């Protein structure tokens with residue numbers, strides 16, 4: 001019912017609000033050695049993939065060969081809930097276009113969507129298949145509303161919502177990436 | 181309403197099911213250098229604190245001075261949702277009794293409870309104060325039910341549910357720890 005509402009606020013309170021204030025510094029750190037006049041710098045914002053109907057794989061290259069892992073940012077650490085130095089790591093990806101690097105950004109799925117999809121594997125979860133696609137849409141809706149009243153976070157990330165038709169994901173990212 | 185139901189399944193699918201199969205190996209690794217005849221070994225199971233009415237701090241020593249951080253386990257890594265080598269770290273704590281180490285175990289709060297509590301800071305979250313204590317209880321209830329049908333995970337962790345009265349948390353852990 002409201003499972004998407006809780007996962008969205010959990011995603012915001014327990015992740016975005018923690019890493020986004022520190023993201024630009026980590027990106028600036030990586031760009032200091034990586035950036036030169038032979039290629040564009042890593043973009044500044046966090047780009048979040050929000051597939052409405054996808055299994056959400058772990059390797060982005062399997063969703064699109066033009067999305068290839070490039071490097072990790074410096075890790076971020078912080079004590080949380082009894083775990084010393086809980087680790088927040090993020091990966092930089094290159095976007096290929098005609099066999100050439102056309103963009104570079106920190107890119108990842110909104111992991112909770114992967115969790116919604118996986119709840120269909122458990123009868124006790126009570127998550128049907130028709131309900132799954134609706135909760136996915138509600139997850140993106142509440143998340144967008146949250147960032148609307150949180151400009152500090154809205155400026156440090158970009159949501160990329162889409163639906164796998166039965167389309168190049170690298171292009172959709174490059175589209176958002178070219179408006180920055 | 182059912183916010184606790186989603187956070188419980190998220191906690192299971194996206195964490196316990198991932199680290200618990202590998203926990204004993206990480207503990208065995210740490211015990212190889214740490215364990216000798218002058219002190220007990222680190223316990224085998226993951227002990228999870230489930231406060232029903234607590235702000236859930238990040239430093240366990242602030243909840244009880246007899247709970248002191250000792251060391252981290254070896255990290256666990258795994259690609260997830262586009263993040264290469266997402267990091268899972270856990271902390272070992274000593275339980276003091278009469279100024280002497282009486283136990284050693286991997287110990288942490290159930291982080292989602294900390295998230296429930298924090299949702300009261302946002303009007304758009306719609307989480308009142310009366311609803312907070314009820315969702316906390318429902319989180320522990322669904323989690324217990326999940327582990328009931330998951331003996332592979334139930335044997336590698338122990339839930340410690342309690343309620344801060346208006347009581348020694350180190351003792352409650354030592355009680356569970358002495359039945360192992």
Ligand SMILES: Nc1ncnc2c1ncn2[C@@H]1O[C@@H]2COP(=O)(O)O[C@H]3[C@@H](F)[C@H](n4cnc5c(N)ncnc54)O[C@@H]3COP(=O)(O)O[C@H]2[C@H]1F
Pocket residue numbers: 010011012014015016083086087088089110111112115190191192194195196263266267268269290291292295
């Ligand atoms: N390494 C871990 N150490 C301790 N506990 C963990 C860990 N992993 C999972 N758990 C437990 O399992 C719940 C559900 O995890 P999830 O499905 O990945 O959903 C996450 C995820 F989408 C995003 N997020 C947060 N940190 C990162 C990160 N480092 N990378 C990417 N993404 C993140 O925010 C959501 C809520 O995070 P929260 O913490 O409040 O709840 C979690 C937590 F209780």
